[PDB]
Structure formats: structure tokens, C-alpha cells
Design a protein around this ligand. Structure first.
Ligand SMILES: [Zn+2]
Ligand SMILES: [Zn+2]
Ligand SMILES: [Zn+2]
Ligand SMILES: [Zn+2]
Lengths: 43, 46
């Protein structure tokens, strides 16, 4: 995950951002209005 | 005094974001920091 510095494994991928995300950053992605409608897929 | 209206938690706003022009609760502030689009927003404690 390169959206945080928790050195956490990416367990998801956002299509629009083309970014792997950890579970914490997925939850943040869903809470922020600009990103809440992004297509986030489990990896 | 104010609720955060950027989530449905009916949580107290402790901050405001200049770029969003929105009061934010602690959970929303933390989320703001973890999303690349909002990470550099000017979030000010109230
Ligand atoms: Zn992360
Ligand atoms: Zn995204
Ligand atoms: Zn909130
Ligand atoms: Zn903002």
C-alpha cells in the first residue's frame, strides 16, 4: 500500500486510482466523498 | 457545536477543511489523510 506508511500489505486495488490499498486505506477511500464511488477490488 | 456532515456518524466536528469547505470529525480527518486526493488539503483544528 502506498496510500499510508503502516507498511501494510495491499489486500485491495482501486481501478480509478490504479493503486493497491491496505484495508485501512480502503475504509478511508470509502469515507472520502471524492473516492467513495471508486471501484475497489479484493486481491 | 457542529456535526460533521461528510459522514453519517452524526459525530462532532473537531476540524474544518478549507478546500472542501466542510467541518470534519476525527474519523473523517484521519480518512482525509489516507486518500491521495485529499492528503494535502488544509485541515484546521477548531
Ligand atoms: Zn494503506
Ligand atoms: Zn480510488
Ligand atoms: Zn465525519
Ligand atoms: Zn478536504
Amino acid at each position: 500500500c502506498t496510500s499510508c506508511e503502516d507498511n501494510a500489505p495491499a489486500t485491495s486495488y482501486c481501478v480509478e486510482c490504479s493503486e493497491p490499498l491496505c484495508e485501512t486505506c480502503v475504509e478511508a477511500h470509502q469515507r472520502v466523498k471524492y473516492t467513495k464511488d471508486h471501484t475497489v477490488r479484493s486481491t
